[PDB]
Amino acid sequence: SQRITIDPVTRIEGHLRIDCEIENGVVSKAWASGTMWRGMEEIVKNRDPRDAWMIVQRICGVCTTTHALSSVRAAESALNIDVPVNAQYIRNIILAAHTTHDHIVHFYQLSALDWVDITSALQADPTKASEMLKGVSTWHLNSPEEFTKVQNKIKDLVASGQLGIFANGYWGHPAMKLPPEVNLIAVAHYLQALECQRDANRVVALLGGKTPHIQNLAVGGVANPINLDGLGVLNLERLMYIKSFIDKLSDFVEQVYKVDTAVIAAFYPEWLTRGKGAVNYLSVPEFPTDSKNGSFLFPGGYIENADLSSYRPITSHSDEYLIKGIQESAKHSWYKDEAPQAPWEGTTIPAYDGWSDDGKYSWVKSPTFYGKTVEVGPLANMLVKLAAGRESTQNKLNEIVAIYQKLTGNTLEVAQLHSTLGRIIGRTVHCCELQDILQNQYSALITNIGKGDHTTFVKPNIPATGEFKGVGFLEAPRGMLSHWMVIKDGIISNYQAVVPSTWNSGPRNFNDDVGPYEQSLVGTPVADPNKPLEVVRTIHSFDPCMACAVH
Amino acid sequence: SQRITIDPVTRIEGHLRIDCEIENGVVSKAWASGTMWRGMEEIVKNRDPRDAWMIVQRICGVCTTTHALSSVRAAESALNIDVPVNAQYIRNIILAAHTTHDHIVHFYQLSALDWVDITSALQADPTKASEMLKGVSTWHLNSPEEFTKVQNKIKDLVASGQLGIFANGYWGHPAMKLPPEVNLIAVAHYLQALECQRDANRVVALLGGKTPHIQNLAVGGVANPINLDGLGVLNLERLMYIKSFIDKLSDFVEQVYKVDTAVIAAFYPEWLTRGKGAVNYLSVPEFPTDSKNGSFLFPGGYIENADLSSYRPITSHSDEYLIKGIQESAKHSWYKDEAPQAPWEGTTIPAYDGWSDDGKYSWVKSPTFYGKTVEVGPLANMLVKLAAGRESTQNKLNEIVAIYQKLTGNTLEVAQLHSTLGRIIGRTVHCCELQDILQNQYSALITNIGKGDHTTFVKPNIPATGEFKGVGFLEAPRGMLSHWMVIKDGIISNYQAVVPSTWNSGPRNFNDDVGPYEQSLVGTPVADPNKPLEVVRTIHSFDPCMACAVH
Amino acid sequence: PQRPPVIWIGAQECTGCTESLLRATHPTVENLVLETISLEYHEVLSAAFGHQVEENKHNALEKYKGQYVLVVDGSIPLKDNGIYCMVAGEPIVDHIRKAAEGAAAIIAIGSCSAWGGVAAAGVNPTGAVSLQEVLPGKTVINIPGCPPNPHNFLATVAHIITYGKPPKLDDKNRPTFAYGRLIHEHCERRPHFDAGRFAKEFGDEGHREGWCLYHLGCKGPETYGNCSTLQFCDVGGVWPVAIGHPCYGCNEEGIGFHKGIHQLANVE
Amino acid sequence: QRPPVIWIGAQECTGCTESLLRATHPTVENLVLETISLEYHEVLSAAFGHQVEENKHNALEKYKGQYVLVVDGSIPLKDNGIYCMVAGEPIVDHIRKAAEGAAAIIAIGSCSAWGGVAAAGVNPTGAVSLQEVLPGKTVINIPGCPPNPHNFLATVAHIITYGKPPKLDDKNRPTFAYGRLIHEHCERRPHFDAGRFAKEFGDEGHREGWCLYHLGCKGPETYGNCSTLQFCDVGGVWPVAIGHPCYGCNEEGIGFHKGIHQLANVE
Numbered sequence A, B: 001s002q003r004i005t006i007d008p009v010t011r012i013e014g015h016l017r018i019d020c021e022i023e024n025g026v027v028s029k030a031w032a033s034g035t036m037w038r039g040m041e042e043i044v045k046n047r048d049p050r051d052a053w054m055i056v057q058r059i060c061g062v063c064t065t066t067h068a069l070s071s072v073r074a075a076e077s078a079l080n081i082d083v084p085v086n087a088q089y090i091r092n093i094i095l096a097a098h099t100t101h102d103h104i105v106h107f108y109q110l111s112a113l114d115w116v117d118i119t120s121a122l123q124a125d126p127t128k129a130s131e132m133l134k135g136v137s138t139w140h141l142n143s144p145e146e147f148t149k150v151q152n153k154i155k156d157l158v159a160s161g162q163l164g165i166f167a168n169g170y171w172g173h174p175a176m177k178l179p180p181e182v183n184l185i186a187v188a189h190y191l192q193a194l195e196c197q198r199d200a201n202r203v204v205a206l207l208g209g210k211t212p213h214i215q216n217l218a219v220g221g222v223a224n225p226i227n228l229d230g231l232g233v234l235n236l237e238r239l240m241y242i243k244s245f246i247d248k249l250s251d252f253v254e255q256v257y258k259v260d261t262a263v264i265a266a267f268y269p270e271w272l273t274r275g276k277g278a279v280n281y282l283s284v285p286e287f288p289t290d291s292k293n294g295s296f297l298f299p300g301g302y303i304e305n306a307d308l309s310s311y312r313p314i315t316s317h318s319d320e321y322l323i324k325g326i327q328e329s330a331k332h333s334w335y336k337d338e339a340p341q342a343p344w345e346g347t348t349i350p351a352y353d354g355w356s357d358d359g360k361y362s363w364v365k366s367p368t369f370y371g372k373t374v375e376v377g378p379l380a381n382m383l384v385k386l387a388a389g390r391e392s393t394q395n396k397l398n399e400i401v402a403i404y405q406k407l408t409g410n411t412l413e414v415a416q417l418h419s420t421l422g423r424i425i426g427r428t429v430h431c432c433e434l435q436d437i438l439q440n441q442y443s444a445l446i447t448n449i450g451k452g453d454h455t456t457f458v459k460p461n462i463p464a465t466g467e468f469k470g471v472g473f474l475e476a477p478r479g480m481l482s483h484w485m486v487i488k489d490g491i492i493s494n495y496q497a498v499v500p501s502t503w504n505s506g507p508r509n510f511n512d513d514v515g516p517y518e519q520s521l522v523g524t525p526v527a528d529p530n531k532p533l534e535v536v537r538t539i540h541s542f543d544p545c546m547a548c549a550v551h
Numbered sequence C: 001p002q003r004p005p006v007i008w009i010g011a012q013e014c015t016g017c018t019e020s021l022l023r024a025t026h027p028t029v030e031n032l033v034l035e036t037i038s039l040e041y042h043e044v045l046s047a048a049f050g051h052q053v054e055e056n057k058h059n060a061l062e063k064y065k066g067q068y069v070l071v072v073d074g075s076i077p078l079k080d081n082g083i084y085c086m087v088a089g090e091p092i093v094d095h096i097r098k099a100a101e102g103a104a105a106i107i108a109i110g111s112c113s114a115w116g117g118v119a120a121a122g123v124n125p126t127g128a129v130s131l132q133e134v135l136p137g138k139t140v141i142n143i144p145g146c147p148p149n150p151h152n153f154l155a156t157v158a159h160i161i162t163y164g165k166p167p168k169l170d171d172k173n174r175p176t177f178a179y180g181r182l183i184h185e186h187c188e189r190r191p192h193f194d195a196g197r198f199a200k201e202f203g204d205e206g207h208r209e210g211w212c213l214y215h216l217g218c219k220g221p222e223t224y225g226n227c228s229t230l231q232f233c234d235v236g237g238v239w240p241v242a243i244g245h246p247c248y249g250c251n252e253e254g255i256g257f258h259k260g261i262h263q264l265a266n267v268e
Numbered sequence D: 001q002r003p004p005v006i007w008i009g010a011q012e013c014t015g016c017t018e019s020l021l022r023a024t025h026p027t028v029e030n031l032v033l034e035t036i037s038l039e040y041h042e043v044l045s046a047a048f049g050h051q052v053e054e055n056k057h058n059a060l061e062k063y064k065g066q067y068v069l070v071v072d073g074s075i076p077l078k079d080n081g082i083y084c085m086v087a088g089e090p091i092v093d094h095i096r097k098a099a100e101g102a103a104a105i106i107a108i109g110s111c112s113a114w115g116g117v118a119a120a121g122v123n124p125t126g127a128v129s130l131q132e133v134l135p136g137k138t139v140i141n142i143p144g145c146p147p148n149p150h151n152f153l154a155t156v157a158h159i160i161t162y163g164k165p166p167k168l169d170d171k172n173r174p175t176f177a178y179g180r181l182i183h184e185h186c187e188r189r190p191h192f193d194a195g196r197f198a199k200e201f202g203d204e205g206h207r208e209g210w211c212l213y214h215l216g217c218k219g220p221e222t223y224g225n226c227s228t229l230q231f232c233d234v235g236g237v238w239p240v241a242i243g244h245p246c247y248g249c250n251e252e253g254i255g256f257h258k259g260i261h262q263l264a265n266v267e
C-alpha cells in the first residue's frame, strides 16, 4: 500500500489537496481537502440585505456573476419580490454568456493538458492533421497553414528554453494516447478558444458594467436603464452591440468545442467506464422568463439511484421538497458543529486541528439531500434534462454521439455517461444549449421593449422588525448553487452558501459516506505513483472551484 | 466608330465622367471630367492659418488625414516652424496606418470587381480552390471550409433575388478571365480585407481621436499629450494598445494582398502592356524623422522620359527645384484664368459653360511640372524608389515577381511596370513597405519617450504684417499632394491645393497635352461598347478621388 | 427572406460619411449589406457603372416605391441651376427630388446634408444647402457630424426596421439617443472645468494631466452629440477631447467651420 | 529570453487572474508566449503537486534577483497561518521566501493591496495586505476587485521596457491608473453640478443617464481610472455608465465597508 499527496492540484480554481491510498497501482481510497478559508458567510452577516450580493460575489471570480445572482434571488425570496421580466432577461443573458466563457476555459485552459501532449505536437505533420478533420468539422481555422503557425509557436517556446507554465508537464506519460497530429490540433484549438471566451465576456461586460465581478444587479431587479431613445443608457445601439458579440460564439462552440469533446471520448474510451462519483443527481431549473420568478427555460430535478425513469421534476425555486432536503455536516470538516444543519440554521465556527485521515481534513462542509450524497453540475443537469425528455438536450447529445460513432464504430449509452467523460460531455452539451438561450433571451428582450415595457426594478421595503428567511437557487456552471439568508430586525442575522463544488468536493459526511470526488477516484489506475495524471484527469472533470467550495 | 460616356464611374471616390471615342474596337481618344465642385480653396481664405487644416481636411474622407497633414505642413513652412520629433513619429504612424487601410480597400472593395466574376464563383469547387494556394501563400484562412462558407453567402444573396450593389455587374463578360475557383478565392479575400482595414483604422483612431477626419494635429505639432504616468493622456497603456493593432496588419498584407496582386497579373498578363499614362513621374520623400522636418524614411524624385538612371532625387520638402516647377492651367477646365499659374499666385474663379469636346470639360485643373504632364502615385513612388536603389523596394517587388514567375514561367521587367498592372503592383509594394514604417516609428517613439522627451508641440507666432508663403508636401496614397498658403497681415490671403488626382485626372492642358487618365485609355480594347469594362479597369488602377481632384 | 431596401445618393460629399461605415462593428459593413439591408444603389461600392448603375437605380425606385430608405451625404448646390454637382448629365438636386418622392424615410447623414456643413461655409461658393431645404414637404432625419459615429446612423436605420418608425427626434429632427444632450453636459473633464483646471497650450503641464480644453477653444458647451459617451471606433476611450484636442463643434450649425479652433465657446 | 514572473495566490477568489483573460494589449496568450515567462501560476500550469513545487523552487534559484513576484488575495495571519496552506505550509511562508529574490513585487487586487473583502467586518482569518507581511519591501499596489488588467500589464511593461516601476502615489499605486478621484474625471459630473440625480433604478433621471450620487456612488472618495480606461476595451463600459453607482472597490475603507446606498463624502 502506498500513500500519495497531490498538493497543489493545479488547473483548478483555488486551493485543493488530494490524497490517495494506492494498492497495486489502483487507487483504493481518497481524500479531498480544501486548504483555504475566508469566512465569507461571517463577513456578510449583520449587513443590509441589499448589500450582500456585492460582497458575496467575491466568493469566486471564475464563476463570477453566480453568487451575485444567487444572493439577490435569496433576498428577493425572503422579501417576496417578483422580479421584472426585463431584469430576468438581462440576468439570463449574463449567466448564459458567463457560463459559455467558463465552460470553454475549463475544457481548454484547465483540462486539455491532462489529455494532450504538447511535445508530441512537434512531431505532427500539419497537412495530415488538417486532413483528419475533413468531413468531421466545418470550422474555418483547421487549415495546414494554421496548424503550422501553431506548431512554430510551440517550436519557438521550446527553443527558448523557458517553458514556464508548460514545464515539467506529463509529456510521454503512458496514459497519453493522442497521435501527434491530434495533439497539434488541440493546441491550435486551445489558442482559438481564447478568442471565443473573450467574445462571451464582452456580452457580460456590456450588461454587467465589467467582468470579472458584474455590477448591474439589485435586490428588486437590475441597474441597467432601458431607454431606446436615451443617451448614455441601454439604448438600441448598445443592444445591437451586445447582439454582435452573441452572434460570434456559436461557430467555435459547435464546430470546435463540441467536436473536440467527441474526439477525446473516441481516443480515451476507457474513461467512460471510470470516475463515477454518485448514484444521485440534482439540478435546479434555470433562466426564468415570467413576471413571477418562474417559467424556466431549462428544467431541473432529482435523480435517485441513477433511475431517470422515476426522477422527480423540480419546476420552482420555491419547491418545499428541494428546500427541506438540504443539509450540511462538518463531522470531517474543520468546523465546531458536526450534526447535519439546515442552512437557515447553519453555523460556520472554525475548529482547525490539522489533517487526520479518520477525523477532520477539509474546510469544505459535507452536503446531503435527505441524507444522501449527491453529484451536481453539468452531468447532473444533462441527466435531468434527458429524464425530462428535453428534445434539445437529446439532439445535442446525439450529435456528439454521431461524431464518436463515425470515429469508433460504437455508440454511447446513458450508463456510459456516469463517468469522467460523461461529465465532460454534459458540460459541452450545456455550453451548446446555452447559445440558443442567448438568442432566445436577446429576442425576448427586444420584443418586450417594443411592447412598451422599460421596467427593470421594483424598490424593496425591508420590515425593521420580525425574522424572515429566503433562499436563492441558481444552476451555476458547476451545478446547483443556493444562498440562504435570514433577516432579523432588518439586517442579515444568518447567511449560508451551499455551493456546487461543496456538494462534489465535500469530505466524508456525518455517516462517513464518501462524496463525489472521493468516490470517483476509487479504482483509478495509476501507472506512475510519482506522476498521478490519472487522478487529476478525474478530479478536473468536476471543474473544481475551491474558493466556491469553502468560501 | 462611336462615342460612349461612362457617367457615373463607380467604385471611386467622388463624381467622375469618362468619354471615349471608339474606332475599330479600340479607344482612340478619351476625356476625363470631374463633375462636382465645392470651392474649398475659397472657403478657407481669410481665416487664421492655424484653422485651415480642420477645414481643408474635408476635401476628402477617403484620403482622410492627408489634407490635414499637408495643411499644417504648409503653415509650418510659411512660419519657419520645426516640428518636434515626437509629433513627427505620431503624424507618421497615422499616415502609414491610414494608407494601409486605403490601399487594401482600393484593391478589394473598389477594384476587384473589375477582374472577378462573382457568379462564376458559384461554380467553384472549394477544395480545388484551397489546393491551388498550397505553396503559394501561408495565410491561415484559405481552407476549403472558409471558401465553402463564403460560397454559401454568395448563394444566399443570389437566392434572395436582391443583389443590390452586386446587381447588373459584368458577369460572363469576355474580358473576365479568372477560373471559378479563383473568383471564389477573391471574394473570400474581399471579405477578409474588411477586417484588416478596420485594424488599420484602429491605429489611426487611437492617435487621431477618431477616423474619418482626425483631430490631433496642430500648426506646431500634435495635440496628443505624452505622459507615461498620466491618467487620461497618451500613456504606456495607450501605446501598448496602438501596438496591438499595428501587429495585426502584416499577415493579411503579406500573405493575401501581396499574393493576390501577383495572381491577378498572372491571369491578365496583357494588362502589363496597356494603360501607360505618362513618361514622367514625380514623388516626394515622406516620413520625416529628425527635428528639422527632414530625414525622410522614403525617398522622392523626378523621372523624365522613363529614365531611372538619370532621375533627379528630391530629399527635402523645401527643394526649390520641386517648388518652382509646379503650375496649373484651366484652359480646358471650368475656371476663368487659363494661363499656367504657380499655386502661390493661383486663382479658382468658376466659369462653367457645359461640356465641350474641344473647350472646357472638367472641374479639374491641369497641372504640369516645368511644362510637362506627369503621373503621380504608387507607380511613380515605386519607380523613384527603384531609381534610388532602395533595397526594401527592390526586394518587395522581387517577391511579387517570383510568385508571378512560379505561376506563369515568365518574368516581369521594369518596362512592364508602365501599365495598368504596374500601377496596381506599385500600390501593393507601397502597402507592404508601410508595415516596416509602422514598426520603425512605433519603436522610435517608445525609445524617444524613454530618453525623457515628451515634447509634442511648439506654439507658433504669426506676424501681423508681412506676406509669408509656405508649401506643405505629402506623399499621399494617390501620390504627391501639396498645399500652398500665402499669409498676409496675419490671415490666409491665398490657398491652393494641388492634389494627386488633379495631376492624373486633369483635362487637356494649356498646350492641349493629354493627362495620364486620358493618355492611359488610348488603345484600350472594348469588346462591348455598351459595357466598357476595359476602360474602367484602367481608370480604377489610378485610384481616382474626385473630391480630391477638384476640391 | 427580403431585406429592407436603401438608396444612397452622394451630393457634394467628401465620402467620409460612407467611409464611417467601414469602421462600424454593429453591424460591420459586410453584415449591413448582406444581412441587414439591401443596398440598392451606392456609387462607391456598386459593381455596375454608368448606364448599368443608373438602370439599377431607376428599377429599384420603381420596384421599391414607398418602401426604401433614402440616404444623402453631402450638401446640395443650388447656384446656377444645380450645375456644381452633375451626375449622368443632370443636377444632383433633380436626382434627389426624384428619389425622395417614393421614399419611406429620408436620412441626411453628416453635417453637410444635415445643415450645409463645411461646403456651405465662408462665402458658400456653390449655394450649397441642406437636404431638408431641398425637400421642404418631407420629414428629413438629420444625423450630423463630420462624419458621425456610424452607429448614430445604423441604430436609426435599425429602429426603423425593427420597430417600424424612426427613433425619437429633437426639434432639429436629430435622434435623441445620439444628439439629445450637450457634449459639455456629459463630459468627463467637467470636474476640471469646474475647478478652473485648464490646459493653456498643447503639451503644457495641465494638458499632460488631462485637464479641461475650454481655453483651447473646446466647443463642447455649444455642441449637441454623443462624442464623450459613445465616442468613436469602439476601442474605448477615443474621441477628440480624450485624445487631447478641443471639440470643434462639427456636429452643430454655426459652430463647426464658422468659429476658429481657438475661439471660446459661450457657456450656458 | 523573456522576463520571469512568479504568481502566488493567497486568499484569492481568482478574479485577478481571470482579469487577464479579458485583456487585449497584451492578450493572455501573447503575455505568456511573447512578453513574459510565467514560471509559476497554479491556475494555468501543466504540472501539479510535487512537480509544480519543484518548478517553483528551480525558478526561484535560476532567476534570483530577476523575477517579478505577483500576489493576489489577502494573507491570513490568525492561528499561525493555517487559513491558507499550500503543500502543507502557510502561504505567508511561501510568499516571504519568494519575496527574498524578487526584482519587483506587485499586489494585484484590493485583497493583496489593502486586505479587501477578505479582511472586512469581523475579519475571521486575520487577513492582511501583502505590504503588511513584507515590511522591508516596496510593494506596488494595483487595487480594484479586480482592477482592469491593463493597470497591471502596463505596470509590468514599464518595468520591462524602461527598467523601473511606473511613478507611484503615496499608497504605492501607479499614478497613470490611480492618480485621480473617479468623481474628478466622471462624465456625469455635469449632472451632479446641476442637481440632476437618479433617485431609484429605473426612474426618469436614471433612464436619462443622470448622476448616481444619491444611489450611493463612491466616485467622490475612490481613486481609479474606471471612468476613463473603463473595462473590457469595447467602449463605454464601467459600472456608472451601465447604470450602477461606484462601490469604492479600489479604496480601503470604502468598498466592503460602506453600504451600497450610503452616501460618499464630497471634497
Ligand code: SF4
Residues within 6 Å of the ligand: B058, B061, B212, C012, C013, C014, C015, C016, C017, C073, C074, C075, C109, C110, C111, C112, C113, C117, C118, C145, C146, C147
Ligand atoms: S459631413 Fe463631413 S465627412 Fe460627411 S460629407 Fe460632409 S465633409 Fe464629408
Ligand code: SF4
Residues within 6 Å of the ligand: C183, C184, C185, C187, C188, C189, C190, C191, C193, C211, C212, C213, C214, C218, C219, C220, C221, C241, C247
Ligand atoms: S469645455 Fe470641453 S473639455 Fe471642458 S468640460 Fe466642457 S466639453 Fe469637456
Ligand code: SF4
Residues within 6 Å of the ligand: A058, A061, A212, D011, D012, D013, D014, D015, D016, D072, D073, D074, D108, D109, D110, D111, D112, D116, D117, D144, D145, D146
Ligand atoms: S481583489 Fe477582488 S477579484 Fe481580486 S482576489 Fe480579492 S476578491 Fe478576488
Ligand code: SF4
Residues within 6 Å of the ligand: D182, D183, D184, D186, D187, D188, D189, D190, D192, D210, D211, D212, D213, D217, D218, D219, D220, D240, D246
Ligand atoms: S457621484 Fe458618481 S456618477 Fe455622480 S459625478 Fe461623481 S463619480 Fe460620477
Ligand code: FCO
Residues within 6 Å of the ligand: A060, A063, A066, A067, A476, A477, A478, A479, A481, A499, A500, A501, A502, A544, A545, A548, A549
Ligand atoms: N460554477 C461555479 Fe462556483 C462553484 N462550485 C459557484 O457557484
Ligand code: FCO
Residues within 6 Å of the ligand: B060, B063, B066, B067, B476, B477, B478, B479, B481, B499, B500, B501, B502, B544, B545, B548, B549
Ligand atoms: N490619396 C489621396 Fe486624395 C487624392 N487624390 C489626396 O491628397
Ligand code: F3S
Residues within 6 Å of the ligand: C145, C146, C223, C225, C227, C239, C240, C241, C246, C247, C248, C249, C250, C251, C252
Ligand atoms: S468636433 Fe465633432 S466629432 Fe464630436 S467632439 Fe466635437 S462634435
Ligand code: F3S
Residues within 6 Å of the ligand: D144, D145, D222, D224, D226, D238, D239, D240, D245, D246, D247, D248, D249, D250, D251
Ligand atoms: S466599484 Fe470598483 S471597478 Fe471602479 S467604478 Fe468603483 S472603483
Ligand SMILES: [Mg+2]
Residues within 6 Å of the ligand: A041, A365, A496, A497, A498, A499, A550, A551
Ligand atoms: Mg457554506
Ligand SMILES: [Mg+2]
Residues within 6 Å of the ligand: B041, B365, B496, B497, B498, B499, B550, B551
Ligand atoms: Mg486646387
Ligand code: NI
Residues within 6 Å of the ligand: A013, A059, A060, A061, A062, A063, A064, A545, A546, A547, A548
Ligand atoms: Ni467558483
Ligand code: NI
Residues within 6 Å of the ligand: B013, B059, B060, B061, B062, B063, B064, B545, B546, B547, B548
Ligand atoms: Ni481623396
